[PDB]
Design a protein around this nucleic acid. Structure first.
Ligand SMILES: O=P(O)(O)O[C@H]1[C@@H](OP(=O)(O)O)[C@@H](OP(=O)(O)O)[C@@H](OP(=O)(O)O)[C@@H](OP(=O)(O)O)[C@H]1OP(=O)(O)O
Ligand SMILES: O=P(O)(O)O[C@H]1[C@@H](OP(=O)(O)O)[C@@H](OP(=O)(O)O)[C@@H](OP(=O)(O)O)[C@@H](OP(=O)(O)O)[C@H]1OP(=O)(O)O
Ligand SMILES: [Zn+2]
Ligand SMILES: [Zn+2]
Lengths: 382, 436
RNA sequence: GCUCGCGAUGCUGAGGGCUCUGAUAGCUACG
RNA sequence: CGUAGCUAUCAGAGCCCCCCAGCAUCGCGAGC
């Protein structure tokens, strides 16, 4: 049943969080927002496993961008929990590639289309302890009211619109049709760094998948099968934000779709957390022994070291896998020089999903996507 | 970590809170201390860093220098390094410019004091830095919008501060030329003299130093200050920052590299004076020795076959002790300029290239030609460095500066040859006007 | 129904100042 | 063996200043 599934993953993610903070005692149990992914392999609750857990509510300061991929740009909890799912994807890949004995315990099989795909009946589920910023939270940032008045104004231009977190300022701000293009040059000088809101990033994952461009060179697209909120659930706002606002999307590459995961809140809504919001963010993937703590305003850990989630890390997980995947077993055969931005461009089909996405928002009056300065990915491991 | 050393090595000290400037976000506190007799000072966004800069100015003087945060903050020297030590010049230039922008705005009270980038040029007469003199002050970070571009040189294409500062330095240099030319006692005080090779040169050991509150946009700023392609970039008005050029207005970084080859005086002034180069480029923030140096000259060290007097100027590069702090937020639409001799600042809308009531700047193309024309009809035609008969149209009188246009084209190839893109010039019809 | 303007009451990441408490770290004083 | 005092740094609470540009609800005017 759907409501039992919701409360299940709600409890799973909490319990896993506690084990890592010794029953929420640890100094790093302090949070404003919790998130996590959970994997199911069958309808039995005994078949459900927590893949990752995370906290955080802030984004990097403009002047700490890393031109060599060493800083985390966006530490909103659910953004972080996807990045930790990505590590688990790279692990289950190196797992399959050890020998035929190990490869049975991987979640991937070989795909009858090229590259790899998940085995049947393995699904991932996203838990956020609050509604994702922008289109799904902005208009009702509050615990839903027993006596409804749902919206009242579903046709205002502001409904659906793409929106950004904005450096050192409140709100998630719609994309202006005047102001456009961010530059490395500029934000160092003082132009406040725009980051696309979390309701937007999750709508994107509902089209291009949760795996990213780099992993799509090995894997077929993957989707969240449910999205569960621990508090501040609003069925119409959420359904609008996660997909319905772009039901005008067309021409997606094969195996891409507009995914419509199950949406649901939980029975016992989580409680507001009192205090100043922590400026740090913790992350944990299945297979790690402890949590990692990142200063969100620096996108680095307390001693200035890069995270296991940063672009440079993930490039390196990606290369190790690249080096043992037979050129024939690739999903793309495009060759690009070994720099982060360029390897991404080798995922031609993913890049065209992306393009249809950006177009669906634009044609629907909902604004044009805001990207980071191109310099941000023009780094190499060499 | 610094004042801790000062107050554990002379532990009876107390600092006094002097002043505070600006408005709660562009606000800077100044903190002074007098340790072992002499009066130290530092500036900062918060009090604990202001007094940390003052305490470091104390530890460097009374004892010696601090933790040398890599070579990145360490100054690059020039060639024939006079005018005393680097950082002591840099701190003086910065103080002078910032102080004079004070006087120009009711000690920072005016609304026109609100700015993101501050720039200026100051002049020295060698030996002693107490002989310095601020030549020009300016602000701004926006360019003209295409809809407002002028066909008769009545609009300012580019109002990024550091560019506006150079246009003011021009105004200064026309002024000093006219000083020499209006009687024989007045040529006593002009900065120019007559040259061996024709026209005027500068009097031995007069130098100009360029200060910018931050690193110039484009190449010098493409790095992360909390841990290589010298390519050419263009501004993108519709915003701040730059885009690399593809295989529009040039980036400040590129324009200053240019001036590091063809000189700061432009074409029209070259007809009268030998090339003039900056001796220092001092940054009030975002200083990085390798990135600045590359942007400013290294990226085109493959330049060659320059006309006689031209060269690849390799000036002083230096940050400052009391660096400015990044203030995220909207950039102003206005640009302020002032040249020594002027009564007040002039205020430009950078999106219109004209001033607050729609008039032409003293810095726009038409204005500068007008002074150029007036000095031309004053100097004998045998004293000219480039013979230019019957000057009428702006673009042709520029072309008369034939040695300069050579240096321009050597520069343009030196960029292409290094794989750094091809310089973007504006449609030549914009300089097709006369004073008629 | 929506949009624009003016007003009102609220909602939701920065900077700075002054105090209360707690660890680390260095240096003093006293008995 | 203690306890006072003085600079530095990190974490938490309390107060005030300042900003930030969206969003809800309502009122008035106007348009589609
Ligand atoms: O938010 P994240 O989870 O880090 O996703 C980021 C990133 O977003 P942020 O810049 O907000 O972090 C990019 O977004 P843009 O800013 O460039 O839009 C990017 O997308 P690009 O493809 O444009 O780089 C890319 O996602 P993808 O895997 O589809 O490239 C990427 O993931 P990385 O952190 O791996 O760069
Ligand atoms: O505004 P500034 O940076 O002070 O320099 C400008 C101008 O630059 P913008 O057009 O970017 O305003 C021209 O540069 P181009 O676009 O044409 O390259 C021009 O160059 P040319 O006239 O040589 O094409 C010329 O420099 P110069 O006068 O030394 O030739 C000129 O100064 P003026 O505004 O005095 O013409
Ligand atoms: Zn968010
Ligand atoms: Zn500039």
């Amino acid at each position: 049943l759907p409501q039992v599934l919701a409360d299940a993953v709600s409890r799973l993610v909490l319990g896993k969080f506690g084990d890592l903070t010794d029953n929420f005692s640890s100094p790093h149990a302090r949070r404003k927002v919790l998130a996590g992914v959970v994997m199911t392999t069958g309808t039995d609750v005994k078949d459900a496993k927590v893949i990752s857990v995370s906290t955080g509510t802030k984004c990097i300061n403009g002047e700490y961008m890393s031109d060599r991929g060493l800083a985390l740009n966006d530490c909103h909890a659910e953004i972080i929990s996807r990045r930790s799912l990505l590590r688990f994807l790279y692990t289950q890949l190196e797992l399959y590639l050890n020998n035929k004995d190990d490869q049975k315990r991987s979640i991937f099989q070989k795909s009858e289309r090229g590259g790899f795909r998940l085995k049947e009946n393995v699904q991932f589920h996203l838990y956020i302890s609050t509604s994702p910023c922008g289109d799904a939270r902005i208009f009702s940032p509050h615990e839903p009211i027993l006596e409804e008045p749902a919206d009242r104004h579903p046709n205002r231009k502001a409904r659906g619109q793409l929106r950004t977190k904005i450096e050192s300022g409140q709100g998630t701000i719609p994309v202006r049709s005047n102001a456009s293009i961010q530059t490395w040059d500029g934000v160092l000088q003082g132009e406040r760094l725009l980051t696309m809101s979390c309701s937007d990033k999750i709508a994107r994952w509902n089209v291009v998948g949760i795996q990213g461009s780099l992993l799509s060179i090995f894997v077929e697209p993957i989707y969240f099968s449910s999205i569960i909120l621990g508090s501040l659930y609003h069925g119409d706002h959420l359904s609008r934000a996660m997909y319905q606002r772009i039901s005008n999307i067309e021409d997606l590459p094969p195996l891409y779709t507009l995914n419509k995961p199950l949406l649901s809140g939980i029975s016992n809504a989580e409680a507001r957390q009192p205090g100043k919001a922590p400026n740090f963010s913790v992350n944990w993937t299945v297979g790690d022994s402890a949590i990692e703590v990142i200063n969100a305003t620096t996108g680095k850990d307390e001693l200035g070291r890069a995270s296991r989630l940063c672009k440079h890390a993930l490039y390196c997980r990606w290369m190790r896998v690249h080096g043992k995947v037979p050129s024939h077993l690739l999903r793309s055969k495009i060759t690009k020089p070994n720099v982060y931005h360029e390897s991404k461009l080798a995922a031609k089909e993913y890049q065209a999903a992306k393009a249809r996405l950006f177009t669906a928002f634009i044609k629907a009056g909902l604004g044009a996507w805001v990207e980071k300065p191109t310099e941000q990915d023009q780094f190499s491991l060499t």
